[PDB]
């Protein structure tokens, strides 16, 4: 219910 395949989408999802 919360994690990351790689990084890119989850380094830029929040703002």
């Amino acid at each position, epitope marked *: 219910i919360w994690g*990351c395949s790689g990084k890119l989408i989850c380094t830029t*999802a929040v703002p």
Partner: antibody
Amino acid sequence: QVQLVQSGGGVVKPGASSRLSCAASGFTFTDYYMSWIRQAPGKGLEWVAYITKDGSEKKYADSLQHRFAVSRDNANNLVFLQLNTVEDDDTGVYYCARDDGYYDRSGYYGVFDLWGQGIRVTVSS
Amino acid sequence: FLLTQSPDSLAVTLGETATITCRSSRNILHSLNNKNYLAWYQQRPGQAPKLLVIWASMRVSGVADRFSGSGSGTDFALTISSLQPEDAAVYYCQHYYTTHRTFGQGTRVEIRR
């Protein structure tokens, strides 16, 4: 460095089976979901399946009536796509692709940042 | 759940501006971040797609500033300013608002010289 190299494909008879392969290098393979996508004519890009980093869950498009099977080998850095009881709809270019995204309780939301070169499959007698 | 690109084909002159429309059947803007879950790809012939934009308007590393994303709700666009010969390709939009990702049918950019 970072790269996906595909093999397999070629001609296949209707109703028969074909196996596609993808070797990964240059990145931590066990950090990424992996997907397969095809490109037919008369309808362009089509996501077919993905596989998780590895608590192996797999998901498929429903239009493919359970006919395709995706598997993975973290060890040799390989992804496979098996096509079963192929039909005249399955002719096209098949890509594996590195799948980047986030997952929560509702599902996974992703994007394809690195693609293999592409393999052509031709359904023909 | 469809993504309809417009137009199918497009002839744009070198140094000028191309615009590629992507309409979604439904809204693709989530609440916990207020971003649209759309992406854009570029496919030069005999090559695999290359990702350019995520979150509808964010450029990815190693992508020129000529490629700009825009829009909200169900209506989005990719523009390409100061057109270059290497932009001659097919451009697809893709949503990731659900687990069932779908692509637009594609838009070809032909170049005038």
